[PDB]
Write a protein that binds this ligand. Structure first.
Ligand SMILES: O=P(O)(O)C(Nc1cc(Cl)cc(Cl)c1)P(=O)(O)O
Length: 300
């Protein structure tokens, strides 16, 4: 009945189940038109979600036991960078690291495609946010197989060699990677921000018309949009083969940003709450030390 219980219920429908097939036009909304709360209420609940998340982070850091890896993927202008900024703003910098994986360096191209991601994994007690991730290697690379030609370790000397079997094998490799880290103390949560083609267009135009922001918009941004369908295919096949119970994907409607952020904060808090984190407790010995310390201070 409660608005929070409505949200909690709705959130469980966003998890990609391991056995399901994925049609992003039909099975998953870019916009939710049955919202259980107003924007204003959503904004106030998001702030609580960020505070709860900061509390969890501090308990995680003080514990130094599990690590947390949060992956974000999205089409351009879905609101991924803003979502990451908004979260980061409310967390302590000491225990939290954002890595944005760009075009690989020459050195990175001299290792397997997973190496730079493995290198950047979170240490125990830390939270690692991959803003773009290892998944780029079954997404941007799949839409533009020509990139595989610069990958010395990938074994591809001509794009005609690349077929469904090449992608199936990357999905297995990615799954093995995430299972391993999951079996060795890392909680893995993956978010695809799902924005409609129409809303992407409206965001592109809005930016182009802002004399304050339009220095940021290139011709290349259109080019990736012209591959909308190829990206959708790549995303579908990936979500259908790399969401496990242990490392789930969540598809988040991205067309209303406040709602996107709310949902992501909720899911992260919900999932991390299963860890039952608590702050350190003060033992009798420690209590005696405190009382002694305070006595000495007062005695000065
Ligand atoms: O990652 P975000 O989606 O937040 C991205 N926003 C954005 C906006 C426009 Cl109108 C065009 C393009 Cl190509 C991107 P950013 O500029 O915040 O990184």
């Amino acid at each position: 009945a409660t608005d929070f219980s409505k949200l909690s219920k709705y959130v469980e429908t966003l998890r990609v189940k391991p056995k399901q097939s994925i049609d992003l036009k039909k099975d998953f909304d870019t916009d939710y038109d049955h919202k259980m709360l107003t924007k204003e209420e959503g904004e106030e609940l998001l702030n609580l979600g960020i505070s709860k998340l900061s509390e969890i982070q501090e308990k995680l850091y003080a514990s130094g036991t599990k690590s947390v890896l949060i992956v974000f993927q999205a089409m351009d202008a879905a609101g991924k960078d803003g979502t990451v900024k908004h979260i980061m703003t409310g967390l302590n910098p000491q225990g939290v690291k954002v890595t944005s994986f760009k075009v690989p360096s020459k050195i990175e191209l001299s290792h397997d495609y997973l190496w730079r991601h493995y290198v950047a994994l979170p240490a125990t007690g830390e939270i690692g946010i991959f803003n773009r991730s290892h998944y780029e290697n079954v997404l941007v690379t799949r839409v533009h197989p020509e990139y595989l030609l610069s990958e010395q370790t990938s074994g591809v000397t001509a794009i005609e060699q690349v077929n469904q079997k090449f992608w199936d094998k990357r999905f297995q490799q990615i799954n093995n990677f995430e299972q391993h880290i999951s079996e060795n103390g890392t909680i893995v949560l993956k978010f695809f921000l799902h924005v409609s083609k129409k809303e992407q267009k409206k965001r592109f135009i809005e930016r182009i018309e802002l004399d304050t922001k339009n220095w940021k918009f290139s011709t290349g941004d259109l080019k990736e949009r012209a591959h909308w369908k190829d990206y959708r295919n790549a995303y579908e096949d990936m979500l259908a083969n790399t969401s496990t119970k242990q490392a789930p994907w969540f598809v988040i409607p991205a067309d209303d940003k406040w709602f996107t952020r709310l949902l992501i904060a909720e899911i992260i808090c919900t999932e991390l709450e299963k860890l039952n984190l608590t702050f350190p407790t003060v033992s009798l010995e420690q209590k005696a030390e405190l009382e002694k310390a305070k006595a000495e201070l007062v005695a000065e």
